[PDB]
Amino acid sequence: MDVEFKCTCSRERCADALKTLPDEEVDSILAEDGEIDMHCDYCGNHYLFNAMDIAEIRNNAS
Ligand SMILES: [Zn+2]
Fold first, then answer.
1. List the disulfide bonds.
2. What's the CA-to-centroid distance between 3 and ligand 1, angstroms?
3. For the domain 1-62, what is the CATH superfamily, name and number?
């Protein structure tokens, strides 16, 4: 079993696109909804990000 709808690059590209946004803007969304729902800047595929996932990105993309 398989599907023909996937990120053609990797989640890491979508994560890098989130990492460059203002710290106050990212923190404001987390303080009102606890997570972020966004599309990959390279292929448009959607992914979800939370405070714990962003904390791992801040210790891998820095
Ligand atoms: Zn992608």
1. 7-9, 40-43
2. 15
3. HSP33 redox switch-like (3.90.1280.10)
